[PDB]
Structures are given as structure tokens and as C-alpha cells.
Amino acid sequence: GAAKIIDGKTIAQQVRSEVAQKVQARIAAGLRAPGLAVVLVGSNIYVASKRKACEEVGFVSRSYDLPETTSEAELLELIDTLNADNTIDGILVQLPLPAGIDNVKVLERIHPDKDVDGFHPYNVGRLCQRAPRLRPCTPRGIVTLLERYNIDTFGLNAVVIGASNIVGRPMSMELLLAGCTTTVTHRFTKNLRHHVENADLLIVAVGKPGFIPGDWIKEGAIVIDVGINRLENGKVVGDVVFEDAAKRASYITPVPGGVGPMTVATLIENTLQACVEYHD
Amino acid sequence: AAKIIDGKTIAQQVRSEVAQKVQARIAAGLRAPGLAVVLVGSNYVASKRKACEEVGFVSRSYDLPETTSEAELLELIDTLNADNTIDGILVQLPLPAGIDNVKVLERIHPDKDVDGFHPYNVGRLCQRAPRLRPCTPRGIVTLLERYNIDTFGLNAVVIGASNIVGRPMSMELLLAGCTTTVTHRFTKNLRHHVENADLLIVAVGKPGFIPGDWIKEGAIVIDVGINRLENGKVVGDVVFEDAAKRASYITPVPGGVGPMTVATLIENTLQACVEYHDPQ
Ligand SMILES: CO[C@H](CC(=O)O)[C@@H](C)C(=O)[C@H](C)/C=C(\C)[C@H]1OC(=O)[C@H](O)[C@H](O)/C=C/[C@H](C)CCC[C@@H]1C
Ligand SMILES: CO[C@H](CC(=O)O)[C@@H](C)C(=O)[C@H](C)/C=C(\C)[C@H]1OC(=O)[C@H](O)[C@H](O)/C=C/[C@H](C)CCC[C@@H]1C
């Protein structure tokens, strides 16, 4: 078999172009460009690479560089200022933060209307309750892929491998919203293979190179590989053995060039959504 | 033959434990927990209030005319949010047609949302960091705990994906280490899922929806249905006699999950008081 590619790099480019078109239309109408604020505390690519994508679509981005000595109170005051700044549509806080600072308290201080990452508990809870606002970036990008390839999700037996807050858990609530039967597996799952073998739609998010063998994949399955595993040679591979899974799957995301670009594109979509729906 | 999960008895023990904790607060000179219930118009309230009096809580009922505007209602929630003697706020639905349900319910501070359905609280549970939790799913977890049922590694299947039960139930189960499948109206071949379920939670509101002979031998069956029949009886979503020939444990109806829903509301109100409002 020869599974079709889910070309996330191309889809992400189409999404960014659509956003750029809407931004250019706002400017022509006399409206401001969407604005993104990134908060960096102390010091420790992805942020750089993201700003390039924001430049492409016509966003304005601003980056705060705070010293390591910054207190939790100062940081919370900054989020208050950005929350109140009408030119800011999205706030991103890069982790890790200095020790002694409560990560949760800082991230939850972001107003959910500017949480373009989609991981404020209010936004997660809204998605769970079938009334989404700003959505978790990576699971929403995956649903966008299925839509752009015209994959009917209703009644698909979907299996999510990994139950992380960043992917697995919100992924199951997106998939339920899309009408899939959803199974979430994790380290306590016994007979992982049995679940995988019955999956019409497999979302793999364990962060282990080549963890899922092609042998396990249902014939005709749709395979979404969220893994981005840095090998020592500097290159990146997914959680799925591409060459073996492509013998059985109907569609498969490569790595690189699959979910990664869609995570960035969804962050960009969320920022335009925050701008157009919540602040203008 | 299946053993009974006697939720009526468990609920009474949970209530007795709350009541004795309140006794100890009084002996130490601390205030009793307080619950406010807001009703707008006319249309289970008496039974929940009943249960609050049994455990020595303060209770407060606001009975407002159908002429109440949205602005007045929001002002009341603000007042209750700021009242240090109130640990829980319940707003009864439905509200008059002219009033925005969502804005009113989301105005409740999450640490007084003892029903557990503010999106912030649902989102916190989704993120493995629960605060006040939805009452029916949390009551079901308590049932499994009190019967010493080890949940880690169990293949759990939820029948129904309602906001009030099925969806939050999957996040409670994931937190309890279950491999969790959520099925719903678009699920293909329910029998295949039910036959593999070590733990089956049925919450569709349809008497007899799951035939008893689908139940896996030795499964734990949790019946959340409360269906009033033509002959005056109250029945669950599972035919008890048929399921009881195969299950190791089964909740009856009535007397199973229903009492635990009320007891968990009580437990949540004590929790809000002890942990979030008047800690020691
Ligand atoms: C374009 O995708 C590249 C691959 C590929 O091409 O397939 C890809 C390599 C890339 O450079 C981009 C910019 C980056 C991302 C997708 C990273 O996610 C984040 O940055 C998220 O916004 C978030 O900030 C971070 C989450 C994790 C805790 C750690 C980072 C996860 C992930 C790699
Ligand atoms: C003691 O349980 C009785 C059964 C039995 O004994 O087995 C049981 C009959 C009983 O009287 C109690 C007071 C009531 C509940 C459990 C009701 O749920 C709610 O009120 C929850 O607070 C919440 O408000 C739910 C609302 C639903 C949309 C409709 C109500 C569903 C449900 C019956």
C-alpha cells in the first residue's frame, strides 16, 4: 500500500495566506493589524521561527525580555497591563519561568480572550462544553487537516495515544466535537495494540521516535503523528514508523511537514480570531 | 450474581463524614459552610436543601420574581461572590427567557461553583488539576473508591457524551488511570465497545438502551439513568436483572448514582469552605 500524504506544510501555507488576505483587508479598511505579545523571563528558535510566520501574515509582534530577577508580582502586573492593552490580541508566556514563580498563576492571569495558545482552563472548559472560544493550537490544527482533506469525522473510531494536557486530553474533546468515538490511552493502558488496531483515526502524541510500528495500524486508517523527536544528528522524526505505516494507512502525516506547521498556523488563526471577534 | 454498589448507603456515609467535619469546625469556633441558591420564577431544590440542613450547613434561598432583569441577577451573583459566609452558589435553571444563561452562570466565582460546571472548573479537571468537580462524575469516582475498585489500567467505556456526565466523566476516569472510551449517538457498533469494557458507565437517559447480555463478564456497571416509566416506576439505562447475571458489581436504580450526586454537592461545599475560603 501507499498512503496519501497529509501535507501539513502546504495546508499551513494556505491557512497563513488566508489570514494574510484578511489582514490586508483590515488595513485597507483603516483597521489595525492584529497584535501579539511574547513574554520572555530570563534566558534559556521556535519563538524566532514563529515571529517570521507572524511577519508573513502582517501581524505586529512585541517581545518583552525581563531579567531573571523578575518577581512573580512584577510578572503578574505585566500580564495585567497586556490584558488591558487594546492593541494586543494575543499573549504568549514562554516557559520555563524562573524558580519561585508559580507558572499556573501566571498563565491563568492571561485573559482567556488573549490566550491564543488555547490552554487557559476557561478555554479548555469551553471546548469540553461544546462552546469553544480560543482552542488549543495543536488539536485544532489537526481537525483543520482533516477538514481540508475532506475526511468525514462523524462515527470514526478515534484513538489518541498519550493523555498530555498539551495534546492528548484536549484532542479527545476536539474529536468528540467532531463526532468521533474517542479512546484516550496512556501509560496504564494494557494491550495498547488492541486499541490501535481498531482505530479509523490514530493520533499519536507520546514523544518517542518510532514508537508505533506500522504493523499495528488498521488498514485504511488515518494516521496523525504529533511527535517531534530531535535525533542527535539534528534532524526530526515522528512517533510513527512512517515507512511501515504508509503500507497500511489511507492517509498519513509526515514528520517534519505535518502537524508542526499546523500548530504554528493555528496560533496565527487564533490571533486573528481574537482580534476580529473579541477585540474589534 | 453481581454485588450491589449501594450508593444510597455510600451517600449517607459521605454526608455523615461532612456532618462530623462541620461538628469539629463548630467545636473549634469556626463558621459552618454556607450555600446560596438563586431561583428566578417557578418550576430537587427541596431535597438538596434538606441535605444541607442534615449536615449543619447554613443555607440561603433567593426567590426572585420573573420580572428580575439580567443586570439585577448579575449584581446578586457579585454580592454572593463577595459574601465571605457563602461558600457555594447555585443558580437554578431555567431562567426567564430574556436572560443570558451563560453570562449569569459564568459570573459565579469558580471557587464557589459547587455544581462544578463553570468552564474554568471543567478545564482544570481536563488539565489534571481539578478544583471543584462536576458532581455526578465525582460521585461515581467516590463509589469506586469506597468499594475498593482499582481503576488503573481498566478499559472504561462511557455511553453518552453529555456535558453534565459523559464528557467530564471521561476526564475523571483518565485521572483515575482508566483507558477511557466515550461513545455517543454516532458510535458505530456499540456492542464491540461494551464487550471490552471492564468499567461501563451508562448515561443516555433511555431505559434498556444497553441490553444486559452485552456486558462483559465481571464488568463494573455504573447506571446513571433515572427514567420514570409509565407504570410509575423509576428505572435506569441498563436492564438490571440481565446485567446482574454478568457484572461483578452493579449500581441499582433508584439508590445508586442519584444519592451520590447530592452528597457530592455537599462535599464540594465543604471543600470550598475548608480549602478555598476559610482555611486553617
Ligand atoms: C513547523 O514545525 C516544525 C516541525 C515541522 O516542520 O514538522 C517545528 C520544529 C517548529 O519549528 C515550530 C515553530 C515549533 C513547534 C511546532 C513547537 O511547538 C510550539 O512552539 C508551541 O507553540 C509551544 O510553544 C511549545 C510546546 C512544547 C512544550 C515544545 C515545542 C513543541 C513543538 C516542537
Ligand atoms: C437521590 O437521587 C434520586 C434518585 C435515586 O434515589 O436513585 C433523584 C431522583 C433525586 O431525588 C435528586 C435530588 C436529583 C437528581 C440526582 C437530579 O440531578 C440533579 O439534581 C443535579 O443537581 C443537576 O441539577 C441535574 C440536572 C438534570 C439536567 C436533571 C435532573 C437529574 C437528576 C434526577
Author numbering:
A (entry chain B): 1 to 44, 49 to 284
B (entry chain A): 2 to 44, 50 to 286
From the paper:
FolD is a dual function enzyme: it catalyses a reversible NADP+-dependent dehydrogenation step (5,10-methylenetetrahydrofolate (5,10-CH2-THF) dehydrogenase (DH)) and a subsequent cyclohydrolysis step (5,10-methenyltetrahydrofolate (5,10-CH=THF) cyclohydrolase (CYH)). FolD occupies a central position in the folate-dependent C1 metabolism. Here we report the identification and validation of FolD as the carolacton target in E. coliΔtolC and streptococci.
To understand how carolacton binds to ecFolD and thus rationalize the mutations giving rise to carolacton resistance, we determined the crystal structure of ecFolD in complex with carolacton. We soaked the apo crystals of ecFolDMeth with 2 mM carolacton and harvested them after 16 h. Carolacton can be fitted into the additional density and refines well. Binding of carolacton to FolD has a minimal impact on FolD’s overall structure (Cα rmsd 0.27 Å) and is facilitated by three hydrogen bonds (K54 ε-amino group with carolacton O8 and O33 and G261 main chain N with carolacton O29) and several hydrophobic interactions (Y50, I170, I232, P260, P265 and V268). The hydrophobic interaction between carolacton and Y50 causes a partial disruption of helix α2 (residues 45–56) and allows the Y50 hydroxyl group to form a hydrogen bond with the side-chain of R234. When carolacton is bound, the N-terminal residues of α2 and a part of the loop connecting β1 with α2 (residues 41–44) become disordered (residues 44–49). G8 is not in direct contact with carolacton, but its position and orientation in FolD implies that the addition of any side-chain will cause a clash with C-terminal helix α11. G261, which forms a hydrogen bond with carolacton, is part of this helix and we assume that the resulting movement of helix α11 leads to a clash with the carboxyl group of carolacton.
